[PDB]
Design a protein around this nucleic acid. Structure first.
Ligand SMILES: [Mg+2]
Ligand SMILES: [Mg+2]
Ligand SMILES: [Mg+2]
Ligand SMILES: [Mg+2]
Ligand SMILES: [Mg+2]
Ligand SMILES: [Mg+2]
Ligand SMILES: [Mg+2]
Ligand SMILES: [Mg+2]
Ligand SMILES: [Mg+2]
Ligand SMILES: [Mg+2]
Ligand SMILES: [Mg+2]
Ligand SMILES: [Mg+2]
Ligand SMILES: [Mg+2]
Ligand SMILES: [Mg+2]
Ligand SMILES: [Mg+2]
Ligand SMILES: [Mg+2]
Ligand SMILES: [Mg+2]
Ligand SMILES: [Mg+2]
Ligand SMILES: [Mg+2]
Ligand SMILES: [Mg+2]
Ligand SMILES: [Mg+2]
Ligand SMILES: [Mg+2]
Ligand SMILES: [Mg+2]
Ligand SMILES: [Mg+2]
Ligand SMILES: [Mg+2]
Ligand SMILES: [Mg+2]
Ligand SMILES: [Mg+2]
Ligand SMILES: [Mg+2]
Ligand SMILES: [Mg+2]
Ligand SMILES: [Mg+2]
Ligand SMILES: [Mg+2]
Ligand SMILES: [Mg+2]
Ligand SMILES: [Mg+2]
Ligand SMILES: [Mg+2]
Ligand SMILES: [Mg+2]
Ligand SMILES: [Mg+2]
Ligand SMILES: [Mg+2]
Ligand SMILES: [Mg+2]
Ligand SMILES: [Mg+2]
Ligand SMILES: [Mg+2]
Ligand SMILES: [Mg+2]
Ligand SMILES: [Mg+2]
Ligand SMILES: [Mg+2]
Ligand SMILES: [Mg+2]
Ligand SMILES: [Mg+2]
Ligand SMILES: [Mg+2]
Ligand SMILES: [Zn+2]
Lengths: 61, 97, 83, 60, 23, 206, 127
RNA sequence: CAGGCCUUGACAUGCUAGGGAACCCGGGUGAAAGCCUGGGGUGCCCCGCGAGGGGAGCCCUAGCACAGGUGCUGCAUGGCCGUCGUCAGCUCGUGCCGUGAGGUGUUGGGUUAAGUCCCGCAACGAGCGCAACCCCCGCCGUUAGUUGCCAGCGGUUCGGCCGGGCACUCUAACGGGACUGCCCGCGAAAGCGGGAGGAAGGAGGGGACGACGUCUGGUCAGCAUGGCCCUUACGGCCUGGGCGACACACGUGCUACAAUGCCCACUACAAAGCGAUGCCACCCGGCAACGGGGAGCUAAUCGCAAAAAGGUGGGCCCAGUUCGGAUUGGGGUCUGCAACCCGACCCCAUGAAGCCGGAAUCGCUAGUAAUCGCGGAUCAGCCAUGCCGCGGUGAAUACG
């Protein structure tokens, strides 16, 4: 079997290929979003990473 | 030669089974009495309200009650007598040999 | 993916447009609503206008992208980001 | 979009996947019981008035 | 664990069979 | 809104089904559709005769239908004439042998669905809605009834502010199973909107 | 030559047959200690005969079906108790005071709509 | 939402006028829709050897009447629903009191889960509620004995398999059973405490059932309905897109952080349901999803079916691990016209966060909580970890 570095390289070439053509799958790898149809309104933390909290919308008084 | 009965009411189903059992009982020979087969129950569970009120429901069930009877010895006395008998609308009839 | 017991899928109404082109000497811009079609070796060198739901997106096709659907190269949503 | 929809429901569709049930009483797309061809709402209506043969309020 | 498809327990949880859970 | 249907609450106790047959999954629904399709046709045509109860009995490939009407003469027709044109148009609906029957209503002021349509008619006729209820309750009780309750809800008097009016006499135990409460609802239409009348007759307890 | 009791607990029904003998038992075509192997609660089934020193005296032939082994145990305990009082009703006392006569009617409560279980309510949050 | 289309329209019901009618086959263009098209044939009652000729099924076009609208108002409405709340309450009639609103009764003393009862009283009764009649579970009987059962016999390919039988189990319809009924004690009484019998004792456990009303509560998008509004379009058909977006924030959940655990093999014990372009025994091909075969069953018989936690044996040795299973590469399978956006599975590889969670906060009083698996409805398939149900195992604690 092909292993370690060589396998990693071959995995890398595959992702690289998707980006360069570049299919929707390739676009997702560009922005580091999920690739397999998961929702992104919530969760997706594994791909997106730690929460970058942001101000919300204020309420009236 | 056996007769199997089905219907949605147990009172009418049993009455007709009880009658058929009687019909052969007069005109010999032998009957294996009406046995109560297990009831198949179809349930429907529904949200009571028309809109959005999920946590309250109403349970509805539909019961197809079941009876089986055995006519041991045919004897065209009874084998005729049944074709000339009145059993209500609620019930359906299966006749085998 | 689509079971290979079945055939590789194209709409045929798009394939015939391509094949008629191959004869007479290509090319021509091809307007299609078949995102669902597979890209096929006879399509290389062409440019096929996939409709994303709003516009026909011109797509040039090469060998490196043969196994994919046409819709894969015409993204349906526009994002840019937030804030 | 209703009468055209409840009507188009009956039309034998171009593909058998495009077929779907309507409530034969009111034309509701959702929560329709194949056994009755009735939606969950209409089911409760007729059942309470005894117009569903042998169908009654469960309790256990 | 139950979320591991590559196990007996996992295939049970998902109610499916395969190499890891045969029938 | 809370209270359960008096009828559905008593099916198999003080109440029997309107449709009294058996069928299997393959054909419950077509049988159900025909029944409904039937009741519709009859409810509109036999309105004048005061349709109260439609009972449908079925065996195989033929169907009866028993109509309970307080003025049968409208149902039968001119020397057994109208029953034909309907049974003709009925079998045209069915494809079965429509054994249409007309059964008499002995006292029409003891039929809750009847009482309802009577009051609904009175209020389409712009009558005093409070008075109309009081009289309907009075007649029902006069007819030997153990209890009566009638309820009008909607734009009473055509007021912009919707309301609910109701009168009652005697006992009306909706919680009691062994109590025969005839229930009926009539929808009343007016220029200003739709009203709704519910009639409750406590015929008696077994 | 035989004494019978009908044993019931929690969906489990046991057909017990008490015959005199060395004191050997059988459940559903296989031996008792084979059947309830590794279940520490097993000894409770063979306990009404202790309240009346019949441990050695009776052998038992037992049929069991429905519920689970633990339920089947309580069921056998009922029937084996029932078989003894049929053997002699003088045993009714010294078995009834210990409750071997009665069948507990504790069964799985029905799950209710708007709940996760029978009584387990969905998690509350105001706002 | 974008684009391409239709105009008496996808649909109802009457009216003219023409083809002529039907209907099943196509064909060109096109993403389809649509537009343009080309086949064969209609009796009726009939004047009819006849040339013929029109009446009325339904089709088509033209032209009207009309249709259509998930467009708006839940601050015009019916209906149905949530809720306070299964809370112990809300009232009426006649009488009495007050100039009057209103009061009395419904307050009081005792009692109860209860306006449940008991005693008292200018009140005496009565209704809607409570309880009861209904259903499931627990004991027993009756009636039944196949497709269910097998105690004792006879065979026995060792499987209730066959004769045999319905005892038991069960199935499922009808009954019985509990009433503080009996004993003691305290009580004016109602009741309370206790005891015996008994499967069950103080409503035996659970369900169904929700008062007058409240919230201008919810729903004009399930339906109905007043009014307002649109009319080569705010109606209708189609192709594609979107409802599946993602710096973020909240709710309800699933799976875990491990050894009271994880894994492989072997071995048991449920219940409620579902099933004729359905469930699929078993055989063979595939590591497998599945595929080809192919019996049985219209199903207490045939099948979904293995229940799982458990039990037995061995492995792992405290490690971000044989814990966890996200994410990603690759290769396949199936439904489907079609899985790019956006399906579920299977297999190889990948093996993230997570070491028990800040302020805060939830559920449950017993076969409950916890934990374990099973089924169904919707449904081609399925994003179900949701919901409604079913059993298995089975606690802790309540001083107050
Ligand atoms: Mg997404
Ligand atoms: Mg919920
Ligand atoms: Mg070619
Ligand atoms: Mg509509
Ligand atoms: Mg569909
Ligand atoms: Mg549907
Ligand atoms: Mg693992
Ligand atoms: Mg009650
Ligand atoms: Mg006007
Ligand atoms: Mg049972
Ligand atoms: Mg449980
Ligand atoms: Mg508004
Ligand atoms: Mg409102
Ligand atoms: Mg309303
Ligand atoms: Mg609103
Ligand atoms: Mg105003
Ligand atoms: Mg008064
Ligand atoms: Mg004063
Ligand atoms: Mg005075
Ligand atoms: Mg007063
Ligand atoms: Mg009061
Ligand atoms: Mg008062
Ligand atoms: Mg007071
Ligand atoms: Mg209470
Ligand atoms: Mg008093
Ligand atoms: Mg009372
Ligand atoms: Mg018997
Ligand atoms: Mg409002
Ligand atoms: Mg509407
Ligand atoms: Mg409106
Ligand atoms: Mg569309
Ligand atoms: Mg959504
Ligand atoms: Mg979840
Ligand atoms: Mg299913
Ligand atoms: Mg790690
Ligand atoms: Mg870490
Ligand atoms: Mg690991
Ligand atoms: Mg992949
Ligand atoms: Mg997809
Ligand atoms: Mg550690
Ligand atoms: Mg833990
Ligand atoms: Mg409690
Ligand atoms: Mg666990
Ligand atoms: Mg499940
Ligand atoms: Mg499904
Ligand atoms: Mg998904
Ligand atoms: Zn409906």
């Amino acid at each position: 079997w092909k292993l370690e570095g060589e396998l990693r390289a071959e995995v890398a070439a595959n992702i690289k290929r998707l980006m360069d053509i570049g299919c929707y799958r390739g676009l997702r790898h560009r922005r580091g979003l999920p690739v397999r149809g998961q929702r992104t309104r919530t969760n997706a933390r594994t791909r997106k990473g730690p929460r970058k909290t942001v101000a919300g919308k204020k309420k009236a008084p | 030669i056996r007769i199997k009965l089905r219907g949605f009411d147990h009172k009418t189903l049993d009455a007709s089974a009880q009658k058929i059992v009687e019909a052969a009982r007069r005109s010999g020979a032998q009957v294996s009495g009406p046995i109560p087969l297990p009831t198949r129950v179809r349930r429907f569970t529904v949200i009571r309200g028309p809109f959005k009120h999920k946590d309250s429901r109403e349970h509805f069930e539909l019961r197809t009650h079941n009876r089986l009877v055995d006519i041991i010895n045919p004897n065209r006395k009874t084998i005729e007598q049944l074709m000339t008998l009145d059993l209500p609308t609620g019930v359906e009839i299966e006749i085998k040999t | 993916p689509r079971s290979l017991k079945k055939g590789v899928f194209v709409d045929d109404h798009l394939l015939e447009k391509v094949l008629e082109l191959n004869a007479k000497g290509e090319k021509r811009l091809i307007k299609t609503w078949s995102r669902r079609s597979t890209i096929v070796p006879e399509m290389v060198g062409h440019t096929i206008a996939v409709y994303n739901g709003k516009q026909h997106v011109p797509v040039y096709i090469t060998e490196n992208m043969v196994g994919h659907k046409l819709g894969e190269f015409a993204p349906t949503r526009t994002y840019r980001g937030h804030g | 979009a209703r009468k055209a929809l409840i009507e188009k429901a009956k039309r034998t569709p171009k593909f058998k996947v495009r077929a779907y049930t309507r409530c034969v009483r009111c034309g509701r797309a959702r929560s329709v019981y194949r056994f009755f061809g009735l939606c969950r709402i209409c089911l409760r209506e007729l059942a309470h008035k005894g117009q569903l043969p042998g169908v009654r309020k469960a309790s256990w | 664990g139950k979320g591991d498809r590559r196990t007996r327990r996992g295939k049970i949880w998902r109610g499916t069979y395969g190499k890891y859970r045969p029938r | 809104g809370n209270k359960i249907h008096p009828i559905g609450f008593r099916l198999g106790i003080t109440r029997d089904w309107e449709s009294r047959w058996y069928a299997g999954k393959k054909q419950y629904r077509h049988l159900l559709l025909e029944d409904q399709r039937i009741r519709g046709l009859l409810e509109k045509e036999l309105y004048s005769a005061g349709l109260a109860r439609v009972d449908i009995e079925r065996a195989a490939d033929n169907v009866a239908v028993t109509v309970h009407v307080a003025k049968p003469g409208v149902v039968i027709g001119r020397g057994g004439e109208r029953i034909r044109v309907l049974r003709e148009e009925l079998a045209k609906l069915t494809g079965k042998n429509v054994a249409l029957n007309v059964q008499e209503v002995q006292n029409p002021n003891l039929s809750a669905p009847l009482v309802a349509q009577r009051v609904a008619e009175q209020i389409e006729r712009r009558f005093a809605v409070r008075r109309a209820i009081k009289q309907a309750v009075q007649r029902v009780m006069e007819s030997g009834a153990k209890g009566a309750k009638v309820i009008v809800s909607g734009r009473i008097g055509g007021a912009e502010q919707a309301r609910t009016e109701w009168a009652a006499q005697g006992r009306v135990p909706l919680h009691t199973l062994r109590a025969n409460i005839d229930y009926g609802f009539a929808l009343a239409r007016t220029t200003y909107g739709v009203l709704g009348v519910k009639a409750y007759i406590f015929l008696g307890e077994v | 030559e035989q004494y019978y009791g009908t044993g019931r607990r929690k969906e489990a029904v046991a057909r017990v047959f008490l015959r005199p003998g060395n004191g050997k038992v059988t459940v559903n075509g296989q031996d008792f200690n084979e059947y309830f192997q590794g279940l520490v609660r097993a000894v409770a089934a063979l306990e009404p005969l202790r309240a009346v020193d019949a441990l050695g005296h009776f052998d038992a032939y037992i049929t069991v079906r429905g519920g689970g082994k633990s339920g089947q145990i309580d069921a056998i305990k009922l029937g084996i108790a029932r078989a003894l009082v049929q053997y002699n009703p003088d045993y009714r006392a010294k078995l009834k005071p210990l409750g071997f006569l009665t069948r507990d009617a504790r069964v799985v409560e029905r799950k209710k709509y708007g709940k996760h279980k029978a009584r387990r309510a969905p998690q509350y949050s105001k706002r």
